[PDB]
């Protein structure tokens, strides 16, 4: 629960609450970053009333591009590093949502997801987010650390979308056919940290059964010195491997007598060259041999023990890739049907009011004279109901019209708005009647998201 | 330093001021249900004091404790700790709203009665001081009796303070000597929330005359004895800020270490029903009054309130006499009233200006409606109204913003009546600004209403 992500939006409660607090506060991509204290405070006051570290820790982690394949928070200031640099405190950093987090929250105010009372019953909070891209698979959940209850790897948005589009179009396909199609499209995890996946079996096992051992490796380049001395240069590391602990481990293995080929270690990493750990080897040593000993004795090679465990309708389940994709598609179709239902109800309310306003415009001299002749507002309201054959809510809307609405252009705007809303109502009715339009909406809206925010695969796969 | 010394005008330090302002702005008022304390903590932290330390909740809790503040400013529900060592419950498990007296600290803060400044990130404004419509620094005091506290201003009885303030309002031009005599005549001494006794008059007078004095406090002890000669001392009140648990521990320690030779047992029989009741059994061969005297010498059953009346005045820390504390308070009230009246006058004039435009429109209403309907756009109607009625942009906009409901007969006459009413209100506000003694009378009457409703009896008895 606090341990396991919801299958539909890939979130656990503290992360969902932070993102909803930010959204409700207006901390969007198109406005200046807000002090992080503000997002922490809003979350603490309304959703998570504890002064524990988890709120700000969640905000920070969601801002780190080495941590999330698709960051949900856009941080400004010191949010730490892939090594042991601590993040600054919340009064020294700033944060707002990223554009993709805006897609997690899109149209959440249109009754697209169930809300329930918060801890003190004073406000509602969402049980799940609309999640207009497949966040669980895109950003993953848990980790390689011992004690993680789940370990779902991140994936490439464009590949996931191909699988989602396939499952949408092929809505009659059985589980076997769906699993083969989505496994053809999702090549394997795609970590924010790039690196390599070596072998095919662990990935297949993970997708077919919900568990598999996926061998990851970093990347080593070989450089020559003038004095004839060759060095190995590590430029990428496996997902969740701490850069400082890795550097430290090499030193320590060297002392403990492993890694006898190594004469020197220097961290040359920087903002411009990225990760660049330079390992000089002895003139007697073979580069290729030293690299293999690094795989053995350090996290330059480490296994990702995939465990695709998520909550589905309140129950933890270990899921195959076809199930992760299909439950996500079911959620998107639910969000679309709910959004269209909401829009239709609001359009009908608006049309009802505009019909009354248009009746008033058609009888404007009489309406104005009736209101001026009425001794009180209640007498005018009653008089309007009789004159125009309208109900209380329509009459109140006439009485609430401002004199500015009577300028010719504004009268026409009311007429035009009624025609427009009746066309909108017709369209929304049609979407509700046609599952093919509903599937088409998920497809088109996700395609636009992927066209704008999709990116290249970073992790290379070696069978 | 701003953290250690109260402002002289409202008696607050920044964290307490920010908590109260956050609670007020959140609508956590006395006339609405208590809100979880977490909400007041969060609103303060996000907008005014962005540190994760417990200073905010500590502030909120201390203001809710009736043994800590003579006139509590927070109304707590749940476990806010005790006069001993019991920890308060966490902020998700307690609830809090402002008390009626705190509402008087914040009264009319939205009427430009105090300077506001941008908060820590520049997104919102926060008050530099609160209106403080009762003399909170003197009523609740500041600092404390422990060695090394930066200041120690005692709490006082609200009714006695109001008598002193009233004298100062009436005698606005009295010099310091006369003012000091008059206020020391009316403010008898500290009045602690924890009651107890003050012994003698010298220390109180010293404190008021010079800003420093040693005021001897005592708890209340009763001797209970029976016919077998069994005797016990029963302590039912302690001096201000004497922690009940640390006091009990200190007796056990003084006994273990060879003072208080007359004591055989100590038992805490305090309860919600009887209040504080610490029972000290004395040995058969001991004399009760002798043991009481040794408890005064060797424990905080008697202890000094080392008054040190240090507060910030116009940004400078100053050690103040009682006449200065009163006069700086009065000057702040006169400032609040002049500022409030200036604000009300500007707003009334703005409203009269709009009403004059609306009355012009009503006089020419056929023409106005015809003109608007014949106008292609709102911009064209607005220009046409300016020309038609000889008004300005803001008046023309108010006409365009009128709802059709305002055109019913009683509503047309309401607008015209409101202009006459607002003009009378303007004359009255002008008269207040022109008459300093009217302004003093307003502070007097408003404070009297507050003291009438919220004042209470003296708790600390002053003895020879």
From Swiss-Prot, chain B:
Known EC number: 5.6.2.2
Effect of residue 58 to A: Confers ciprofloxacin resistance, in clinical isolate
Cofactor(s) named in the record: Ca(2+)
Catalytic activity: ATP-dependent breakage, passage and rejoining of double-stranded DNA
Domain Topo IIA-type catalytic: 5-464
GO BP term, pick one: DNA-templated DNA replication
Family designation: Belongs to the type II topoisomerase GyrA/ParC subunit family.
Assembly information from the UniProt record: Heterotetramer, composed of two GyrA and two GyrB chains. In the heterotetramer, GyrA contains the active site tyrosine that forms a transient covalent intermediate with DNA, while GyrB binds cofactors and catalyzes ATP hydrolysis.
Designated name of the protein: DNA gyrase subunit A
Organism annotation: Mycobacterium tuberculosis (strain ATCC 25618 / H37Rv)
Gene field: gyrA
């Amino acid at each position: 629960g606090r341990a396991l992500p919801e299958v539909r939006d890939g979130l656990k409660p503290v992360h969902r609450r932070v993102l909803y607090a930010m959204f409700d506060s207006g901390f969007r991509p198109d406005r200046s970053h807000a002090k992080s204290a503000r997002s922490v405070a809003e979350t603490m006051g309304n959703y998570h009333p504890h002064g524990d570290a988890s709120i700000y820790d969640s905000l920070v982690r969601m801002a780190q591009p080495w941590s999330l394949r698709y960051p949900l928070v856009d941080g400004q200031g010191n949010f730490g590093s892939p090594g042991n640099d601590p993040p600054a405190a919340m009064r020294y950093t700033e944060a707002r949502l990223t554009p993709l987090a805006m897609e997690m929250l899109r149209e959440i105010d249109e009754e697209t997801v169930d809300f329930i009372p918060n801890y003190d019953g004073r406000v509602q909070e969402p049980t799940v987010l609309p999640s207009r891209f497949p966040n669980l698979l895109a950003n993953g959940s848990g980790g390689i650390a011992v004690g993680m209850a789940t370990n779902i790897p991140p994936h490439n948005l464009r590949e996931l979308a191909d699988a989602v589009f396939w499952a949408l179009e092929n809505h009659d396909a059985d589980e076997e056919e769906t699993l083969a199609a989505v496994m053809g499209r999702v090549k394997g995890p795609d970590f924010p940290t790039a690196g390599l996946i070596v072998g095919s079996q662990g990935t297949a096992d993970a997708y077919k059964t919900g568990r598999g051992s996926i061998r990851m490796r970093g990347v080593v380049e070989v450089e020559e010195d003038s004095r004839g001395r060759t060095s190995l240069v590590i430029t990428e590391l496996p997902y969740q491997v701490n850069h400082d602990n890795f550097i430290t481990s090499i030193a320590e293995q060297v002392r403990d007598g492993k890694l006898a080929g190594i004469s020197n270690i220097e961290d040359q990493s920087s903002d411009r060259v990225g990760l660049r750990i330079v390992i000089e080897i002895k003139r007697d040593a073979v580069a290729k041999v030293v690299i293999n000993n690094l795989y053995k004795h350090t996290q330059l090679q480490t296994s990702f023990g995939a465990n695709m465990l998520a909550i589905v309708d309140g129950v933890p389940r270990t899921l195959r890739l076809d199930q992760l994709i299909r439950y996500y598609v079911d959620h998107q179709l639910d969000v679309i049907v709910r959004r269209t239902t909401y829009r239709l109800r609001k359009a009908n309310e608006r049309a009802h009011i505009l019909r009354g306003l248009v009746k008033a415009l058609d009888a404007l001299d009489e309406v104005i004279a009736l209101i001026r002749a009425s001794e009180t507002v209640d007498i005018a309201r009653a008089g309007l109901i009789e004159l125009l054959d309208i109900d209380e809510i329509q009459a109140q809307a006439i009485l609430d019209m401002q004199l500015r609405r009577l300028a010719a252009l504004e009268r026409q705007r009311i007429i035009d708005d009624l025609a427009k809303i009746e066309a909108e109502i017709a369209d929304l009715e049609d979407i509700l009647a046609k599952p093919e339009r509903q599937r088409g909406i998920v497809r088109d809206e996700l395609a636009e998201i992927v066209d704008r925010h999709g990116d290249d695969r970073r992790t290379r796969i070696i069978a």
